[PDB]
Amino acid sequence: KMIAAQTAAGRRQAMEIMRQTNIQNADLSLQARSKLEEASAELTSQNMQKVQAIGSIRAAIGESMLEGSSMDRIKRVTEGQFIREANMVTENYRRDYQAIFAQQLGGTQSAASQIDEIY
């Protein structure tokens, strides 16, 4: 009877440690969604400046009355600058996700070893 109570305590202890790491893992999953929104909001803000800047470039090249391949290039390059930094914003989000994805996984493995040790 006494030994049964201790084993009943043992499994219930495993229930709480698994529940705790599940809440933390679900926390980081919501946090991953938050970082996606922060990156998404940055991309829109960078997109807001891009169209103003590229739109401004289109204005002067048109009025420059010179045309040609070189003037197509200057718009092409400065458009490329906005894209490459836009990619890096996405890349930075991936780096953030990879860390928290790993951090979620570390909690699950840490909980697994402790639960297995209890019983």
Binding site: L30, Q52, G55
Partner: protein, 248 residues
């Protein structure tokens, strides 16, 4: 008529409720999360499926389909939504309703269906920034589009025509195909102000096609001769056309 529901993860044990026309449609409670089997119940995709199945039973026809991270609901064309709200049983960031009227571009669903129109009305009082954006599915991006019930084109029959020399040497006399307005509605993107009056004169100011309506000068975009409309409701591009009505 159409709605969306975001899904974010549920956080292990919060009552999720959906209100359709005042009915508590598709109520569901996530479990505690003690057993490893309950871990599968937190991911965003499975919440979309489970809430959809209960929504199918409660609603008569209401064709409902679920994407990568959302739930799309379509009315049977007999009755509209008229009330769309959800209870997270938590802080709001579990499932929030997505109608066609967002307050901010930040408060937008990431996934959405193939074509989904959203009017971002930041302040109801002010004309402000009431621009429409519409989702593109082939690349996960929202592209702004003009309003739903607005008309984007002039007749092209009353607008000026052009005599064009063809490649073979003969001459064509066609109308000019202009650009449909693709930024906002009629209130926020008004007409070129010659759509009611005759065009007096044509000229080319600095790389812009120019018209003289009754009293106001109308100049196109610098690059685009046939495009008399601004590119974006917000964040004006400094390339957009100018329309000025001489004061005096």
């Amino acid at each position: 008529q159409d709605g969306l529901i975001n899904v974010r993860g549920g956080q292990y044990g919060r009552e999720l409720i959906v209100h359709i026309n005042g009915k508590d449609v598709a109520k569901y409670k996530i479990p505690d999360g003690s057993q490893p089997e309950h871990v599968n119940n937190t991911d965003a995709q499975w919440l979309a499926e489970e809430l959809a199945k209960q929504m199918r039973t409660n609603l008569s026809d209401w064709t409902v389909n679920v994407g990568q991270g959302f739930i799309h609901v379509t009315a049977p064309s007999g009755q509209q939504i008229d009330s769309f709200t959800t209870k997270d049983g938590y802080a709001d960031q579990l499932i929030n309703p997505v109608t066609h009227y967002a307050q901010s571009f930040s408060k937008l669903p990431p996934n959405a269906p193939n074509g989904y129109m959203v009017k971002i009305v930041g302040d109801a009082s002010k004309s402000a920034d009431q621009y429409y954006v519409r989702y593109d599915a082939e690349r996960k991006v929202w592209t702004e589009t003009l309003g739903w019930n607005t008309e984007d084109q002039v007749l092209w029959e009353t607008m000026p025509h052009a005599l064009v020399r063809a490649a073979d040497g003969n001459f064509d006399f066609k109308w000019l195909e202009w650009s449909p307005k693709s930024c906002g509605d009629v209130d926020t993107n008004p007409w070129p102000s010659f759509v009611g009056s005759s065009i007096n004169d044509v000229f080319f100011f600095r790389n812009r096609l120019g018209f003289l309506s009754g009293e106001n000068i109308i100049l196109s975009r610098t690059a685009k001769y046939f495009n008399f409309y601004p590119a974006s409701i917000a964040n004006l591009s400094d390339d957009d056309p100018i329309d000025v009505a001489v004061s005096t």
